[PDB]
A paper describes a structure:
TA modules are small operons encoding two proteins: a ‘toxin’ that interferes with basic cellular metabolism, usually translation or transcription, and an ‘antitoxin’ that neutralizes the toxin and protects the cell from its potentially destructive activity (for reviews see 1–4). The toxin MazF is activated under a number of stressful conditions via proteolytic degradation of its neutralizing antitoxin MazE by the ClpPA or Lon proteases, (18,30,35) and was proposed to be under control of quorum sensing. In this paper, we present a method to obtain large quantities of active SaMazF and provide the structure of this protein as determined by nuclear magnetic resonance (NMR) and X-ray crystallography. The SaMazF dimer is formed by pairing strand S6 from two monomers to form a dimer-wide 10-strand anti-parallel β-sheet.
Residue numbers in the entry:
A (entry chain B): 1 to 113
B (entry chain A): 0 to 113
Amino acid sequence: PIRRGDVYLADLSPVQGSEQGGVRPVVIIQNDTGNKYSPTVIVAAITGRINKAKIPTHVEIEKKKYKLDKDSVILLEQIRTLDKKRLKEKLTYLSDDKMKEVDNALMISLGLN
Amino acid sequence: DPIRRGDVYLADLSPVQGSEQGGVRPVVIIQNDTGNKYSPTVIVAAITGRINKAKIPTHVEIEKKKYKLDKDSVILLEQIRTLDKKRLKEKLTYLSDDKMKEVDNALMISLGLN
């Protein structure tokens, strides 16, 4: 039942250097065929806002959700493939409008167009 | 940093869990070049030797044999991650513009873009 745009709690550790660690919310960015059948998902890390700045690859989460600060930011430059066993609990999902901004930052992040 | 989108680097992807791609293996840099110049991190796709050649929309075959790269190699656009640059070991090679177009296409399939 995992779908693109869902938000899950995931354990991202261990990490190294500037990679995003901890157990934190992540947004599922993989296509839904993959989410249905594959052992793995691709996700983008979400973090609380530290020093609000205008960064092309970041997307602000606006509405406060379950286990999600209102100040939260999706980091489209912190991306990874996780075994699904890493997903802990479904927190929420993002609106179609928000997922458009996510797609746009993802395309910036990955040098697509 | 001289690191550029389309470069292939040897990188240590371990530790990993479950079906995540582990080991020290070649990876292709897929992040935009502003990030590759200035950022502490890069985004990459894992490359592996071909096990049971199959027609998988998110895989891209490397055709020409390169340094420390088998000719049978496949780029896995469903195994993607952000690595601290300290993880990159040595530059193996770079991919042609034509090959990077196939990579972009599989990447868009993989991530549900269009």
